[PDB]
């Protein structure tokens, strides 16, 4: 299938970060075992042209970006384009593929450019020049570069990064001022980071990084906007978030592919994932005993719970029964848990009397890809297996008959799978304590005899919630009452509880907002749901010392380790559905013997938030996580990405306090370290909402229509930034840069004009790739400004209409009509004021003026 995309943009509120703090290309990148894993991934990839899927994706982000100084698009229709590194290639296309739809405007959301040029080392239809040196050419509104570096040794990083810096300076001169360019970087290095911040960033206005996911590598793209228009841009923490995930996905995937076999290999049972099969002779006209029974059962012990299939056919005078299946590392952990091999029921394999024609075994069979739900269960499965540790006993709850956990849990951990349907796994031959019991898990008075340490409720509560016509909270309340009797201390639950506004996944998940109900159309499964705040309350009644940690497992490709190693083909579309379907059905972790946490300040983005942490020793250290990463420590503090942090120790009582000012709307989780060996325990989690929408400002009792103007005071959370706009004739326009001046409370300098009385002025937020969606305040006070009769006034026409001015009710000169003449008492101001340079500005003697459009 298609490729995936990851990207970040310059959030203006983030902190200042220096270049050496950002990570770069790992030391162990170019190596023999590294080159194996990447190259294995490339051959197994099923895709058409990789150049087209990468280019159409990154071009789409470039266009849609919004200019604060314009209120509209960075890149304009029918602009001039330069293509660098143009590929004639070997497709027979004789030129880059994306270009011929890009001229025709066949791409959705991309208008045709004016003309396109081609340069490169091996372009067929363009001039062949060395792009690191000057060349005879014009100036372009857009530059696209796909240069690839060349490396044969780890010491070549000086030579390769030298090319990137050289190309950056040439694309600088190539772009006309106010334009844009994009540059692709194969190998991110710290000296590259040092080059970007010092030279190119101060010259540009805004930047964005785009990463498509096609082949398993660290390739990246970088874009610069508004060239030759000096500014004050620096690195941010949002950039740091982008890199740490971008590098980690390579780190996890390199190990996944290293454990896979070579392309076109030969199987003998050695490889951890592979093929295995056996054959029988003369079956179906008697009884299979001894080798027929032992061999067939012994195969099933090695393969486990995976798919199994048979073939029955005749060849060379021999009647054969064939079994083929695919092993996995997961099957290996089931293999050791057995104390000895169990035998099977051979009746079902005997009753056949027809020929089942065989076929060639395939390793990655299902080219259909995993479904979103099959991907969904894998993420839930993994977070359970990684949570369990050796020796810990488990109170498994709601598991289906196939009993997948025996593979998830370690081999030394005894557990029991209990439910309402009899199982199929054999019940006398395991090595450790393994039992199955059939009883309603919501019944009263059963757990008191059961022994367990960790509890897991996976997809179990949801269906029986609809089963007994209850709401989710009531069904959840019954489960809570039972486990309060239980001897266990760790509970992991998968809960129907959205973490965002209710949206229906079109065709995959349809939700009623009022009746708290779910509807899955692919399965016809109907379920109820509950609230995130309330479930916190339910826990607090059962345990005075209970902690909660809503963890967003999404954005972690560890689950894919289960999928790829099990030879279950993944698809891009299924993951994108799966990542969203987690948000509506997250997993809650409860620490029964934890310590309660308290929030005292106001947790709204941009406000001052504070936390209270009692009981910790002066040598103890606190740690914060956001998406399993860490840049926050009481050890460093100053390295924390969020701007304002203060952590103080108070030995008078035994309390710690923390002061935060979060510039991101993220969910943060806490960790605490006790002792010089640092034993970690899980603390609470808190959610910070978007900054206050509210706005309040003061307008002076006596105005000031003079040259120096009057001041206006505004109080806003510092995330938003106010710009002045005018809405005329279905479009939004931006006024003069010097008439309205915003600076630090948010204090205004505003010049007063009579045109303000007849125009309408708005305020919008522009700090993002959007303008005007969260704060949008009209100035009706500027619509009706009282004009003192003794005070001098300015004037400037709103537009070229038949404007007409009457003085105290008496007519004088018309405006915007062929042959306007300045009155015998007015003046022309030095500079134009209105929302157009093509509008002149006049200085008028005091009076009572009335304007009229004709």
UniProtKB/Swiss-Prot annotation:
It is found in: Virion. One of its GO terms (cellular component) is icosahedral viral capsid. The keyword Repeat does not apply. Its EC number is 2.7.7.50, 2.1.1.56. Its main location: virion. Disulfide bonds: none annotated. It catalyses: a 5'-end diphospho-ribonucleoside in mRNA + GTP + H(+) = a 5'-end (5'-triphosphoguanosine)-ribonucleoside in mRNA + diphosphate; a 5'-end (5'-triphosphoguanosine)-ribonucleoside in mRNA + S-adenosyl-L-methionine = a 5'-end (N(7)-methyl 5'-triphosphoguanosine)-ribonucleoside in mRNA + S-adenosyl-L-homocysteine. Keywords: ATP-binding, Capsid protein, GTP-binding, Methyltransferase, mRNA capping, mRNA processing, Multifunctional enzyme, Nucleotide-binding, Nucleotidyltransferase, Outer capsid protein, S-adenosyl-L-methionine, Transferase, Virion. ATP binds at residues 462-469. One of its GO terms (molecular function) is GTP binding. The keyword Transmembrane does not apply. Interacts with protein mu-NS; in viral inclusions. Outer capsid protein involved in mRNA capping. Catalyzes the last 3 enzymatic activities for formation of the 5' cap structure on the viral plus-strand transcripts, namely the RNA guanylyltransferase, RNA-7N- and RNA-2'O-methyltransferase activities. Belongs to the orthoreovirus lambda-2 protein family. This is Outer capsid protein lambda-2.
């Amino acid at each position: 299938g298609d490729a995936l995309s990851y990207y970040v943009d310059y959030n203006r509120s983030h902190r200042v970060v220096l270049s050496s703090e950002l990570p770069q290309l790992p030391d162990t990148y170019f190596d023999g075992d590294e080159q194996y894993g990447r190259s294995l991934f490339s051959l197994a990839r099923k895709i058409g042209d990789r150049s087209l899927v990468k280019d159409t994706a990154v071009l789409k982000h470039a266009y849609q970006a919004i200019d604060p100084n314009t209120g509209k698009e960075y890149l304009r229709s029918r602009q001039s384009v330069a293509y660098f590194g143009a590929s004639a290639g070997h497709s027979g296309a004789d030129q880059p593929l994306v270009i011929e739809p890009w001229i025709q405007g066949k791409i959705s959301g991309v208008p045709p450019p004016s003309s396109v040029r081609q340069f490169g080392y091996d372009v067929a239809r363009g001039a062949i020049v060395d792009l690191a040196r000057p060349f005879p050419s014009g100036d372009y509104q857009f530059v696209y570069s796909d240069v690839d570096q060349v490396v044969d040794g780890h010491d070549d990083l000086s030579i390769s990064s030298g090319l990137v810096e050289s190309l950056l300076s040439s694309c600088m001169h190539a772009t006309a001022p106010g334009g844009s360019f994009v540059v692709k970087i194969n190998f991110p290095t710290r000296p590259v980071w040092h080059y970007i911040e010092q030279k190119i960033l101060p010259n540009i206005t805004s930047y964005m990084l785009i990463k498509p996911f096609v082949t398993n590598n660290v390739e990246l793209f970088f874009v610069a906007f508004g060239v030759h228009q000096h500014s004050s841009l620096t690195w941010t923490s949002g950039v740091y978030f982008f890199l740490v995930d971008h590098f980690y996905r390579y780190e996890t995937l390199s190990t996944i592919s290293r454990q896979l076999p070579s392309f076109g290999y030969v199987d003998d049972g050695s490889s951890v994932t592979g093929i295995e099969t056996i054959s029988i002779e003369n079956p179906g006209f008697s009884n299979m005993t001894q080798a027929a029974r032992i061999g067939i059962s012994g195969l099933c012990a090695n393969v486990g719970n995976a798919r199994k299939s048979i073939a029955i056919y005749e060849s060379h005078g021999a009647r054969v029964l064939t079994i083929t299946s695919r092993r996995s590392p997961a099957s290996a952990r089931r293999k050791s848990r057995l104390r000895y091999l169990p035998l099977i029921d051979p009746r079902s394999l005997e009753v056949q009397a027809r020929t089942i024609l065989p076929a060639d075994p395939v390793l990655f069979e299902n080219v259909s890809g995993a479904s979103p739900h099959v991907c969904l269960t894998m993420m839930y499965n993994f977070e359970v297996s990684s949570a369990v540790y050796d020796g810990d006993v488990v109170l498994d709850l709601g598991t289906g008959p196939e009993a997948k956990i025996l593979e998830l849990i370690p081999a030394t951990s005894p557990v029991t799978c209990v439910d309402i349907r009899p199982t199929a796994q054999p019940s006398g031959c395991w090595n450790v304590r393994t039992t199955f019991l059939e009883l309603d898990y919501l019944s009263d008075g059963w757990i008191t005899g059961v022994r367990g340490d960790i509890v897991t409720c996976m997809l179990s509560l949801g269906a029986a919630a609809a089963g007994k016509s209850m709401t989710f909270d009531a069904a959840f309340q019954q489960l809570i009452k039972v486990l309060s009797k239980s001897t266990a201390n760790v509970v992991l639950v998968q809960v129907n509880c959205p973490t965002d506004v209710v949206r229906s996944i079109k065709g995959y998940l349809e939700i009623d907002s009022t009746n708290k109900r779910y509807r899955f159309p692919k399965f016809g499964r109907d379920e109820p749901y509950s609230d995130m705040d309330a479930l916190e309350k339910i826990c607090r009644t059962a345990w005075p010392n209970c902690s909660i940690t809503w963890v967003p497992l999404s954005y972690d490709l560890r689950w894919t380790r289960l999928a790829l190693l099990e030879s279950t083909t993944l698809s891009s579309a299924s993951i994108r559905i799966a990542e969203l379907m987690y948000k509506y059905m997250p997993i809650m972790r409860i620490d029964i013997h934890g310590l309660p946490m308290e929030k005292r300040g106001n947790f709204i983005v941009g406000q001052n938030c504070s936390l209270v942490i009692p009981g910790f020793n002066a040598q103890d250290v606190f740690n914060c996580y956001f998406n399993s990463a860490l840049a926050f420590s009481t050890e460093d503090v100053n390295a924390a990405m969020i701007p304002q942090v203060s952590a103080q120790f108070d030995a008078t009582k035994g309390e710690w306090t923390l002061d935060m000012v979060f510039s991101d709307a993220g969910i943060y989780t806490m960790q605490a370290l006790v002792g010089s060996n640092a034993n970690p325990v899980s603390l609470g989690s808190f959610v910070v909402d978007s900054p206050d929408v509210d706005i309040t400002d003061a307008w002076p009792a006596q105005l000031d229509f003079t040259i120096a103007g009057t001041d206006v005071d505004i109080t806003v959370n510092p995330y938003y930034r106010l710009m002045t706009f005018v809405r005329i004739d279905g479009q939004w326009q931006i006024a003069n840069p010097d008439k309205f001046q915003f600076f630090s409370t948010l204090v205004m300098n505003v010049k007063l004009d009579i045109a303000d009385k007849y125009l309408l002025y708005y305020i919008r937020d522009v700090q993002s790739r959007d303008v005007g969606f969260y704060i949008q305040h009209p100035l009706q006070l500027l619509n009706t400004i009282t004009l003192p009769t003794n005070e001098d006034l300015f004037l400037s026409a709103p537009d070229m209409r038949e404007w007409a001015v009457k003085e105290s009710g008496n007519t004088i000169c018309i405006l915007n009509s062929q042959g306007f003449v300045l009155p015998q008492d007015w003046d022309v101001l030095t500079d134009t004021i209105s929302w157009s340079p093509s509008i002149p500005t006049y200085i008028v003697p005091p009076g009572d003026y009335t304007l009229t459009p004709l």
